[PDB]
Structures are given as structure tokens and as C-alpha cells.
Amino acid sequence: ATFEIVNRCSYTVWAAASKGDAALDAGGRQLNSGESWTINVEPGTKGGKIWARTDCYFDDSGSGICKTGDCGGLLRCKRFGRPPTTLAEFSLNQYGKDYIDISNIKGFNVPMDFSPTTRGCRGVRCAADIVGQCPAKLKAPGGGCNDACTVFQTSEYCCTTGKCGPTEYSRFFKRLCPDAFSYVLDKPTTVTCPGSSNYRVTFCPTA
Amino acid sequence: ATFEIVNRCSYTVWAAASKGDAALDAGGRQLNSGESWTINVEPGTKGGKIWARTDCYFDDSGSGICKTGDCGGLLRCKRFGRPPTTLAEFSLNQYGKDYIDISNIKGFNVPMDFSPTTRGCRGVRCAADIVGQCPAKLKAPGGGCNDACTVFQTSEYCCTTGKCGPTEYSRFFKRLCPDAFSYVLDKPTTVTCPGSSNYRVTFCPTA
């Protein structure tokens, strides 16, 4: 499958793509305002994610740090990034269909639209000013709005027992971005698309 | 080598022992106030660490969450824990010697003494009330005092370029615990002991 990743933000972002135990395509790349990066994701991929990283510094060997979404200090991510990170998530070719979603489960750093570029289903987006309206206890110094599990580390926020309800914090994310997952057991906002669809992820979709 | 881990705190802690890519011995265990756990660490081990975890909830299968030092939600740690975590660190049988230290590089959660139980060298300790005196910007909600790299994610605090100096934050840790590492390039506080020594790690040494 093909994914086109577009940076429409006024600032540079460092895109990342991984499946958690391995990079997807090159795994990461610098994207100046307006640039696009096209990656290829193998069919059957399950559990892939794409996110942006902000304020990064990398050396010549692609080793460094980012204030949001850092994946172990590497430019080419092989693992998931440190919150807060708005997430585009997907599993492809699962019994004939593709499943996509946007998640605020790991917080939010950049607004994003995640849409198919082929026919068959609709896209989802979370483009509210979540960082500006972020509750003080969840604001991250480096930038971004963390989720409550990352900050408080409780079974309720983290849904560790498999049982948990929405929370004051959950509802904040859901009020601003209803189409994104706000906590582990939120009613699913996943989109079902035809198997082998293609997509585009755009950061800072409104402009 | 043998390590005896003793909880002298008035509260329960969940001890953890890992080398980062694998558990050391069982990797983790609940320690009530006063309990001791003896583990065996293979000679030649490099890069091992022991730390305490606070406020944990685990199910019957040893899966759960801790407010400080959580290692992926497992009782038996295979990887390192999430800061803040006071760290006992060691590399054994390295050209005939053992090297030990205590580090505040990943913050501090519980006071600790790390001493040999065999002859040949001295122990180190960090038992100041770092959490009570913690700078507001570094206090962690779940409990503990984070280090500045974890909070701010800058190249200076994280020493990402290999060049960095002490900081307002670094000096706070070093003022209260001079014998522990306060930042990446701190002047070493490592202790050199005879190869194959044995040790004891005590949490909440003063009582």
C-alpha cells in the first residue's frame, strides 16, 4: 500500500512510521513546511502507526532527540515514539479489509487528517487546538498535551484491568476530537476500508 | 554473584532487576516492609540495574501498572523502568573488577544504599529527601522527582551531542546526593570492587 505523508504545518516536522518492532519503509524523515513523503507499506501490515515529531536535532548519523514523539533518539524510527503524539493507526489486509483510525490515547502533539486516496471509505481527522486548550495538569513542557495515563499512571486512566470508564481527561480529548479514540475502551472510531486501499496523512490539515 | 535486596521502607516496594534486554534472576518481586530477596546474577554481567517501583497493582498473571519505575506493565521486569527511578547500576567481572554506582540520571523515587557484602571496596548511598525538596518543575504526579532530560527533552539536559555541562537541575541532585551521578557527564562516582564481589541493596537505608 502507498501512504503519502504531507506536512501542511508552518513548521518543520519529523515524520515517523513504525510497526513497533520494525521501521515501516525508512521509518522517519524530515518534512519541511509543504513537503510530502511517499512511503510503501507491505500488505498484511498490522499495528502500524504514523506520527509527527517536533523540535528535533539530529547529527550526521541520524541520532538525536525530539521534544515530542522521540523514538529512542533515532531519525529512522524502529519503535514507537514517546508521548505526546497524535497517532494515525492502521492494520492492512485483515480478512479482506483495511482498518484505520486516529488516536489521542497517547496524547496529542500535531493536528492531523488521515484519509484514503482510493475509493471505498471516508477519512477521519483531529484538527482542534488541543494543545492551546489543554488542561494544565496534562500540558507537556516540551510541547503537546499528554494523555492522563502517561501523566498519572493509574489503572483507571491506563485501563489496566480491562475495565475503565471515561474520565474528566478523556472527555476533554473527545469533546475537541470526537472522531479520535480518547481512552482505551472508547466506542470505536475505526474506519473500515477495502483491502489494499491507499492513503494520505496530512499534518495541520486546516490551511 | 549474589545480591541481597532489602526493603527497609515503611511501605511496600516492588523490586526489579534487569539488564535491559533480559531479566536478571526473576526480574521482579514484591517486597513488604522488612522483607529481603536474594538474587543471583551471572558473572560477566554488564549494564545491570536494580531499582524499586512504587504503588503497583498486579493481577494473577503478573501484569499491571506502577506509578514509578514501571517496566512495561510486568511484575517480572525484562526491560528498564520508566522514570523517575533511583538506580543501582553495575557491571561485573570486567577485566578482573566489578564496578558499581548509584545514579539520579533517571530521577529519583526511593532512597537507597548500595554496598558490597564482601571485602575490598566501599558502598555508596543516596538517602536524602529528594522527593520532598524536588523543584516544582521536576515533581512527578505519580510520585518521585524526575530528571530534567525526561521532563524537557533538550540536547543540554540529555547530553545528546556528547557535550553538556551541569545545570540548575543537575546541581540540585548533586547537592543532596554528591555520591550519585547527577547528569550524563558528571565526574564519575563509580566504585571499583574486586571481581566477583557480593552486594546488598537497601531501600530506605536510614532507620
Swiss-Prot record, chains A, B:
It is found in: Cytoplasmic vesicle. Coiled coil: none annotated. Taste-modifying protein; intensely sweet-tasting. It is 100000 times sweeter than sucrose on a molar basis. Belongs to the thaumatin family. Disulfide bonds join C9-C204, C56-C66, C71-C77, C121-C193, C126-C177, C134-C145, C149-C158, C159-C164. The keyword Metal-binding does not apply. Gene3D superfamilies: Thaumatin (2.60.110.10). Keywords: Cytoplasmic vesicle, Disulfide bond, Signal, Taste-modifying protein. This is Thaumatin I. Pfam families: Thaumatin. It comes from Thaumatococcus daniellii (Katemfe). GO terms for cellular component: cytoplasmic vesicle.
